[PDB]
Amino acid sequence: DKDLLKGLDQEQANEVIAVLQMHNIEANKIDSGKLGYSITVAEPDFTAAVYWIKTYQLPPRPRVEIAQMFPADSLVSSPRAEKARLYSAIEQRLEQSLQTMEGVLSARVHISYDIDAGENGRPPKPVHLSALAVYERGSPLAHQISDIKRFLKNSFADVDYDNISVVLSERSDAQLQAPGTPV
Amino acid sequence: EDEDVTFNDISSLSKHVDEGLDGYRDYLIKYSDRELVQFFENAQLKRQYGEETETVKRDKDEIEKPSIFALLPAY
């Protein structure tokens, strides 16, 4: 067996395994503790596994949130930083709420940051919101966009239905059967 | 210095002269506190007043037209 990757985290290993299995590549995950996880494959499948690791740019980078750029541990903060942390926490709490609706598997949400304005002697611009979500198979997407828009509209002081973008998609086919072992 | 105007009455002249000062009024409004301005706007009158209600004029006129003597010390 040939080594593909070393020193992975748990979530990275599981994402890599999922992508290899989808293309019929049997892979193995090994745990070395302080050294992390290792992924191995057979020689007949090595070439393909390399090409897919390239194409998907695995392992995945960690998830990015705006509060990371303004660590709250600082001794000094401008109003701009505080306002940024606030918005970056509201975005997360809304994605956590959408995931509880009936049929939703996951969602992502974005808000228009206008904290780059100093707001000195100056009127505030209106808010804009965008959302993505994934649904279970057999869901009438057209009739479900309405609920999301209705729910989002009242979460802010000033939002117009015209200013809310919503994009929905269905789950792909289930990968239930195991890949075949090289002869 | 604008030769095309015409007037008919003391009111029509007052309005046009007041309108001339809005360029300055706006600067004072920008750089001063709304609530201290409103306090003096009350204090010019309310020694006259038998009442507590203030809504009696809807804001859109008075918010634009605080007097200049009210704006100056607040600025």
């Binding site: 009739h143 209705r150 239930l176 | -």
Partner: protein, 222 residues
């Protein structure tokens, strides 16, 4: 080890039919149950051939076949309440076929469905369908517009709807679609910043007159 013994304690949840092609067909009621069954097969607990089926998948598959061999047939839906004797609803006004042709169609459907013993063809009335649609809207007192075309009817519900209206609407629509399908009558639900909820008027010397339908709408200043 029969298949029924492997699916679970709730024996009544599933129905196993022998197919003429030497394969077991498991009839399910919904997606969740469908996956509960498919896991058993895909794990490989059963050695002979088997397949899982449900009404929505089969409606899609049969419509895709009709698209190729009968590209101009007007029809509504195929009902599988009794899976051994499905019922196929055709329009009376829009089709024109002889008894012989109907029989041939029947036999070809039967050849596509190896678990069904026969297919019953029933003629339904379009005016009836459309009338039930409008009656249900009025029964909910939803605001709406109706538009008619050669092939179909469209009901538009739009504007500053209220939560209670949205709820009632989605429930009604979802009930109707399961009976008549989405081929003849369409329902479009769109939220707009419009307090009049799609009504529109123009003002003139005699008073108001109603506008014609249109894409343009006046956002509510209120």
């Amino acid at each position: 080890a029969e298949l029924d013994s492997l699916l679970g304690q709730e024996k009544e949840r599933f129905q196993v039919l022998p197919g003429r092609d030497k394969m077991l067909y498991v009839a399910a009621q919904n997606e969740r149950d469908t996956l509960w069954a498919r896991q058993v097969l895909a794990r490989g607990d059963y050695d002979k051939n088997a397949r899982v089926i449900n009404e929505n998948e089969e409606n899609k598959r049969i419509s895709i076949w009709l698209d190729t061999y009968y590209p101009q047939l007007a029809y509504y839906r195929i009902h599988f309440d009794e899976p051994r004797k499905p019922v196929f609803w055709l329009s009376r006004q829009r089709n024109t076929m002889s008894k012989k042709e109907l029989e041939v169609l029947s036999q070809k459907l039967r050849a596509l469905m190896p678990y069904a013993d026969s297919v019953n063809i029933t003629l339904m009335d379009d005016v009836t369908a459309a009338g039930q649609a409008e009656a249900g809207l009025k029964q909910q007192a939803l605001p709406y517009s109706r538009r008619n075309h050669k092939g179909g009817v469209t009901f538009v519900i739009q504007g500053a709807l209220d939560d209670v209206e949205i709820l009632r609407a989605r429930q009604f629509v979802d009930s109707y679609y399961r009976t008549w399908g989405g081929r003849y009558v369409q329902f479009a639900i769109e939220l707009k910043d419009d307090w009049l909820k799609g009504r529109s008027f123009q003002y003139g010397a005699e008073g108001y007159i109603k506008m014609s339908p249109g894409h343009w709408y006046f956002p509510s200043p209120l």
